[PDB]
Amino acid sequence: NVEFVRTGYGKNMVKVLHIRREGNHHHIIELIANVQLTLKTRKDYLTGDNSDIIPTDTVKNTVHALAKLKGIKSIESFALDICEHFLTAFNHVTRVKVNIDEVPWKRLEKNGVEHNHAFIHCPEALRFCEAEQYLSKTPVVHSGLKDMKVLKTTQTGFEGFLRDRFTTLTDAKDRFFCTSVYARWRYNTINVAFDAAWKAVKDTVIQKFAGPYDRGEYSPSVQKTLYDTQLLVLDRIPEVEEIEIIMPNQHYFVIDMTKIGLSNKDEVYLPLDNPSGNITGTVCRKP
Amino acid sequence: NVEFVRTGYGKNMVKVLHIRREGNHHHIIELIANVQLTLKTRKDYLTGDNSDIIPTDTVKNTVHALAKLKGIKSIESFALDICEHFLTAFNHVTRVKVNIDEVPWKRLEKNGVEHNHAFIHCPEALRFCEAEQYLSKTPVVHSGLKDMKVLKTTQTGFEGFLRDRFTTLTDAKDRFFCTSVYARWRYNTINVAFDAAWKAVKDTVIQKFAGPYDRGEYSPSVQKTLYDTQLLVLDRIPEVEEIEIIMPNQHYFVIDMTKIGLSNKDEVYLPLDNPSGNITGTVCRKP
Amino acid sequence: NVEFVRTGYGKNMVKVLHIRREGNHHHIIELIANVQLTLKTRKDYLTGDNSDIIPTDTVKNTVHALAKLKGIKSIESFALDICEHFLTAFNHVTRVKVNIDEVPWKRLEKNGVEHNHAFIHCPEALRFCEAEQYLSKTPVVHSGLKDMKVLKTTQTGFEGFLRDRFTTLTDAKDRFFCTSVYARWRYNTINVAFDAAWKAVKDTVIQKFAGPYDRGEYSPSVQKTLYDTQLLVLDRIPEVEEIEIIMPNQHYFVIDMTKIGLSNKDEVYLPLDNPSGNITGTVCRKP
Amino acid sequence: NVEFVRTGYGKNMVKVLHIRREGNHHHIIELIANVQLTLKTRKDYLTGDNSDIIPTDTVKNTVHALAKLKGIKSIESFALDICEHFLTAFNHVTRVKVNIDEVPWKRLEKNGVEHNHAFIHCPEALRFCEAEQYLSKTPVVHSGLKDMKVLKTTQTGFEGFLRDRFTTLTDAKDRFFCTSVYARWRYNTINVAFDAAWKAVKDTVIQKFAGPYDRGEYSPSVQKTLYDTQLLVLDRIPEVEEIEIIMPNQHYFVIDMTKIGLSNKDEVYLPLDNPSGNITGTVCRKP
């Protein structure tokens, strides 16, 4: 009658912070990790036989443990070590997937001197990764950024679109563009400078969204902005193979005041939570 | 150079309530809808051409319009109307995907008597669905439930698991099982009694988790509970082809008070948010 | 120099579940507890002297232990027991304040048959309380409800209001009224059937809001419905001395469709999250 | 029977962005506003008489219109204008309280240059205010910061506390301190440089929390750090009259790994959400 398409289990929301003291200067990294395992045997699902179960409490313990043993250089390398452990320290685990979120701790700073041990929370963008590996295979790593809220107040338009029966929207020479960018890309090798590449992607995203800093750059189409960014990432980082981007369109509308006898010449805007535009795209290297 | 692997765009978070009134006896449905279109041309991405763009504001107007023209029998059939509209009122749309959540309104009820026009918000579980359709192919509907938080204070155990360097957990005959169930199923056909189906899946999950009101039912691994309910769903509902279940294990630990000279005989427990067990499974019919 | 206006410290977010095993029949209560203490000494703030500090860990430990020792009948009596503890088992404590939220567990019920040990989450309204006590004084307790989202589709209207130069709203004999009621009452005595008192308040609010399940009741202003609800609580529950009510007005606007060539005569509604009407009032007995 | 204690009504979550274009340089402020009015007449509650009601929709429009008409220079100035209007344009209004939250837009900046029209979201700390005014009387302005998450990995301890039967905590010379500062102060005059005052208070808080960026400062008690911060606020900003500070203690615990045969030598920490220490205080100038 039935057949397994997919199985997995583990422990989620494992929070951990690791510290590396070199002199008075403390290095910290705090992350929330989830690990999923796939077992060779399915006798746990079929007959309630636990003899193959590495308890989720043990998965928790292992994540804590590897953190002491391997230390934590990046969430991507940590994810890779979790993968390697469960694949090598056992023989009945066929797949392991680690997805990690990083807590965006920034070193406290006043005018170019950096506190040795104090940190502030300024999530410009949130960083995450994934590592997936099949038994004795070459593992695959994804990295990405999320919740990077940016706003432009000009140098965007939306004209030359299809009218149908339901279109009411007129051409717009000029209008605000606000988004909360999600980006996620696959590396074609494990051998990457991860903190450097992540920064590079982030910088590319903001720069092609905003710059040049004086007059900005006109963008006719959110689709095109998104795409040009996918091309600029693929030029700057040979180790990124595929990249995905999602950009919500968070709307700011000039509030029409004439029914109350005033003229609003593009001064007061309504920020509107719902609904929102959504523009997506995934491109990869021509193999 | 590069190649597109995937594109899409549309409007997310489109809220709507449709009402149908028979004098003083009113019937309502409220939902939040997201729609995505894929276009044959990518000239929007490549060059910034807006020639083929249906504006997201139009998607919004359309969702609104179809609620009036078509009415809303269920979140599923509404989803199917949207898919079919964008595939047939246009030539250049290759695929449409709509994901919708139902705002869980329950009619006000006291001792058998039901109110003609008043509602309370008592979400047992939240209803959702997706309909994905390619041009000139048959549309595919997924339906599901989420955030169904249930608790069992006994009739659960977990013994005979594997021990490694990192195991600290001791066998347990009896323990709390708390979860917040998420399920997703692909229908094999468009011809379904949607309301009755969704309820039947829910009642199945609740009845198998709880067992008889009299004595309960013992479960020795949540994986088996998961697997049993999948099978039970594939018996109860023919038009369900595949079913995925995620069961979190949101923990309740007996507080040890010996360090404060009291002996806690399983009376007072600590609800702990993080981390949580997570047990997943995805089973389809053997063709 | 300066003067203290108020001090306190304590533990917040102390999550706890208490079980009473009455045969096969389990009684559950889960709450989130916050406890604050004021001290006779301010040498804590002044010079950093900790000798009078009950550590925050200890106040956590105490809440746990009191749950074992005193048991938990209702969130109120528990608050009161926490209060009395801190004031009688110490000497330098001038004031204690306990605010707790109840986790809305509802015993599974098939059709009159109640499960011995299974429970589902149904956040109909959320129960909370506060008990505050000064040393050697009789304590003060508030109880209340929040997040009771209720909707009525007719039997509400709003006409004959002040029109000024900024007003655009037109008269309406009939419109939706959706709120998420918040209520908070003080008792005149420690000696109340708290569970019962709570139920009756809730039943009153839902009742005056919905009226007869058959014909409804016309409400010409939410102010008036708010006031009528207050008075009803005060007749039904002699031990309530003062009652506050917050009623948001969560709007559902008829979607005008003339610009797209349809006549949506009150079928399709746009639920709007923001902004929202807010209507408040606090009434007490003529002392 | 009964007598009123307190009444009030208005509009909540009124979102607004105001833009000012001086050449290529664009300036924005985005905020979210709540307005409550009290009336002389109570006929609205008593009998459902609306003749004195300024409709909530009008309050929304008033807020929009005032943004255009008066401009928005700071959230507090805007609050005052809203107060002013409803008290002077009308007769029957006895009180107006306005509460505003600011959306933390920060101008995007790279390599010594600042973008003329691009912004990013960095909630280092979140700004808010209140202005409340009675008819013909002087208005009162409170301002505040919130969700300022700061973390230090050393230079904090807790020893010399009171011991009781429910105490297990031991003396601790050195530990992490992570908090999320909330502070709210009343001004003794409405005549203040709001943007700089705000900024000074913020900097004082991070300042006194971190100590020197070299060695930090040993802190023995958060009550002292609290009080110490309060006094430096009062001394540096003569126009703040009263200051409230709430500091949670969000715990980072050393993970004991000896049960798995490992020495965690203060390298790996568990971040705990719940429960949290909590330390509050409100000091003012002596009249």
Author numbering:
A (entry chain D), B (entry chain C), C (entry chain A), D (entry chain B): 8 to 294
Reproduce the article's own wording on this structure.
Urate oxidase (uricase, Uox) catalyses hydroxylation of urate to give 5-hydroxyisourate (HIU). This is the first and rate-limiting step of uricolysis, a three-step enzymatic pathway present in both prokaryotes and eukaryotes that converts urate into the more soluble (S)-allantoin. The oldest known structure of the enzyme is a tetramer of the tunnelling (T) fold domain able to catalyse urate oxidation without the help of cofactors. The zebrafish (Danio rerio) urate oxidase (chr11: 8151055.8158017) encodes a protein of 298 aa with a C-terminal tripetide (ARM) corresponding to the type 1 peroxisome-targeting signal.
